[model samples]
Target: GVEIETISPGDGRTFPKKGQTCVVHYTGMLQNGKKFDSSRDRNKPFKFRIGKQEVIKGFEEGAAQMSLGQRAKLTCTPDVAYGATGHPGVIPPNATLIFDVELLNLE
Candidate 1:
């Protein structure tokens, strides 16, 4: 089972520790479970370093506590997820997101 854990209070200033990299397999979808993006579909793992702005704020924060090979279902609220503007033509405004993530590697 997966759960949400708060690493920092949602003050919009928290960021991942510097130079840490997290590799994960992730699926992004609307709140109703409509899948939009998935790493599995590409047959490759997604990797990004923390504090590098390679990922969204909500994703970095949510995966901060994960260990290698761990899986989590992260439910991100609009403010922390996509915000009101969303991602241009992809996500709609103020849409909360659900991510099923698997931590593949950490460095």
Candidate 2:
């Protein structure tokens, strides 16, 4: 679902479970490198449950594999992103997305 490239490793002891919540900071971009959204810019960490569909498939899957303080580049193929429909006004059809994500906390 997501191709993960580790940018920085983490020392946290546990992985976030499916029903647990994760807090992260992320910059969402298109394959062309245009940023569409960022939790960092807003100074607020984004939060979502690991398997709750609160985010794109790639993001959720990526988060589930991360540990606190880990930073990674998650390359999301169209099928795991917005797909053919795309995200209205922010993304295009069949877009491949990229996310720079830092796992901050798990609850």
Candidate 3:
């Protein structure tokens, strides 16, 4: 239900794991070049725990493949995202989400 494309590679050093926290600069869209949300716009990186179900399944799965300083694009189908019941007012039902994520830190 997801597709990933690595845009920039990071050092083969550290990676976020289950229960670990990840910091990222990101933009959330619907593949229409219109942003629904962005961490960069807030001038901060969004942080969340891996494998903790703190975010969507596609985000967790895609983020697990990232390393600090890495950048990637993740496209998630409803199955791995909000599914048929999307975030009202913020997202339409069964929306396909497009996320451009940059890993800033892992802890």
Candidate 4:
């Protein structure tokens, strides 16, 4: 499964719907526990539309299911992630990725 234990529980009512924008904070890592990137490191949250392709599909789908203030870990399979061609230098091919995510806000 992708989603993990709650760090901060959300409103518990609404999940992100299509056309809605979501702002989230995330740290991405390889399956072998190597960190690739972190929005937190940059002190910024990522904002993107739920149904848009601004980010990876796995993250979009996972974020769609989250509520505001929600925090969890998502394991993204390659199909929904980078696929056979992972990000060069940072990630390996066919890698399963782990993302520590927090749903900060939505509109």
Candidate 5:
């Protein structure tokens, strides 16, 4: 297993559990620091639930480690993040995405 570590515990903070929805703000960028997408820039957050497959596998897994009001910079490799196909229109194949994520709420 990889040495998975978290800077802080997501304890006491409610993570998306099954159908529970989570609202968050995020900025996705490339390893070279090129911006791809940002919810903060549009002032519109993104929402999804755990186990819903509403996002990439890494995003779903990473969201589970965040607490409400928590913010973190996550680096996800192509395999765990966007995969080989990528978004086609946005992300390129085998690219790494850096995400600055803010966990807003879960309900």
Candidate 6:
């Protein structure tokens, strides 16, 4: 499971449903403060369909819990993130990931 901390509360206006596409901006890092990826740095928002496994398990689960405009910090265990195998080259094996995420839109 992932650990969630709300950085900013949302409007509580809408929640994403299964098959809905989520638009988000995020910064990913490791426990040691090494950055792995960031949509912010790319100046682009990322999109993924809910319940579709388009991203890591923890990511989808965390995002699913957010309302529109929510910002959160997620501490994703290896089990819920990349697992023991991890993402080759980018994420180390058995690594726990940290993400600063914001829900920009859902459709």
For model 4, residues 19-105, the per-residue Cα lDDT tens digits are 887788999988867788999998877777877688887677778777878887888888766677777777666878888888887
Clash count list over all predictions? 0, 0, 0, 0, 0, 0
User: Which residue runs does candidate 3 get wrong by more than 4 Å?
Assistant: none
Name model 1 segments beyond 4 Å from true: 1-17
Q: What C-alpha lDDT values do all the predictions have?
A: 0.69, 0.82, 0.80, 0.78, 0.72, 0.83
After the best TM-score superposition of candidate 2, give how far the Cα of residue 97 lies from its true spot, in angstroms. 0.3
Question: Tens digit of lDDT per residue, candidate 1, span 14-81?
Answer: 33357876677888878874888999899777877877777776677777756555666777677765
**Could you estimate the TM-score for every candidate?**
0.77, 0.90, 0.89, 0.86, 0.81, 0.91
Per-residue lDDT of candidate 5, residues 51-106 (tens digit): 86878765777777777766767677788655667776788778877788777765
Model 1: lowest-lDDT 10 consecutive positions:
6-15
Top candidate by lDDT: 6
CA RMSD of all predictions: 7.0, 1.4, 1.5, 1.8, 2.9, 1.3
Shift of residue 92 alpha carbon in model 3, Å: 0.7
* Model 6: CA > 4 A from native: none
Give the 10-residue window scoring lowest on summed lDDT in candidate 2: 6-15
lDDT tens string, model 3, 1-107?
56778785777457788788789888888867578999988987887888768888878787877788888898988766667777888887777889998788757
14 Cα displacement, candidate 2 (Å): 2.1
Per-residue lDDT value at 46 in model 3: 82
Tens-place lDDT digits, model 2, residues 65-97? 778888989888897666878778898878888
The candidate with the higher TM-score, 1 or 2, is 2
